[PDB]
Amino acid sequence: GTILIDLSPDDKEFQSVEEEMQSTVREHRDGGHAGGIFNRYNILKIQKVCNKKLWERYTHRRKEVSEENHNHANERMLFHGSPFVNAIIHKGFDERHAYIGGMFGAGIYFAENSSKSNQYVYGIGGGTGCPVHKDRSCYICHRQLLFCRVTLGKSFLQFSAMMAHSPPGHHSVTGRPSVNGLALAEYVIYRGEQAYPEYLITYQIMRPE
Template structure:
């Protein structure tokens, strides 16, 4: 077995290790500043340009690597003896394959699961079905078709786990058995599906994905794939470094190595008046109490990486819009620190997909449905930079934007809307596709 050396790694998105400490208040002549401190030994961010952590070898028959928020493991073993919230069975229609791994899973789960498979296979025409766990050490079994596209299949499994709030899933090397798929391609597809998932969810419920295989040769294939994604970088990055490729805006106040700051703007400032004007174009009847600028360096950096990627992909820089998002007072601290996490998706609307919704007009977001008044009658709207890019019509049930090209299912639209010619709202499906720039607190 190959020996794995620990090393720092390059990541596609940022990985940040920090603990939020006490808030502090500072008064300045032109604004009020609320900052959130790090302890002195925590003021260095561990950042990179990717999502892959260090490849380790905790056991002689296991490799492990962090992929974003997911702990990814590959190990030799018997999947029917694994313990996880979800176990995945790779089979074929009508979901009753009694060969290889599928045989072990069905026999281990018991006759009740086989009977349930038989019933569900007749009722549903999806590419997977979900049954009870039976005698296996899991809550549910997701039965997938091994002949199907592996990346799409694993993406569907991860989405199903997330929707059900499960924390761990165990799957075989889908398609490498009776389906005869190329093991190298399967390993690549499984890992890429996890990457896709981590780019949608910054803080998912699902936090562990384990691939259990029965051949040492397959273990080596996964090792090679994981190892090639691990690239050494400088172990630390100072947030004030001049080498920062995505500089924070010049108009931001000095953050003094804080995690993030909330800056209260003052009436009469050009920045305040500009935000007020944008809001008042459709919300003249409301009275603004305060406007705050959100200075969150981590969110800004990840947003700029996404913007650069979209600009390159689309061949132009006209991918950003300034939109509005209404919310309640309880959600404000979370958005300020973590952005528009998709765990909030569908909180108020799902008609155009299970993403985060942003309105063209402030009036739409000011509705009590979206910006629910607190006990004192105050309401809250964010002015948001949103990467809408190339968009299309949305519809209920979407969990990602549709594919642009039926022959290339991985080439997706960037966002969806309610009306292509005259959009009133946009929906995005990736956490780093929107930056909450200003928070307006107002009342009727």
């Protein structure tokens, strides 16, 4: 039931999604090992992901969370990178898309930094890199990220040196950076219904000059 609608580069929606992608790139403590060496992206395409059933699954859960949190869904727009992006857009997020080994337990992880999610496009730690060249810093191969609508509800704050259940009385976990002053927050949900994959972004990382 999923259809993908291309956005024009002239459309304000394309431009605002591109700006979030580009402006949330940072340097990583791995020197580029997982995601590659780059300061910016070449955006090739942005598509709106449209699936009625999956949207209604998201909004149903959003109202449940809202009603448990003084009518406040605490909804964010966050990046997700995964080898399973094609399954996600067709079937929705579920337990199969969890990062079993993540620092906040087996859940589905989202980033404010697009460059954090980029580290996961080819697997955990960047896997072995792109399938064609086996290069984690490949500047040729096309990559894909999701920019997703995520319900956080009441989020458990984990101060952090950088499927399970949410902590009792909470709907998500927030990983607050406590060492790297430039890192933005990461978030974990434990129910696939608490995210909708709204934009599919196709891109290349760009080699710095």
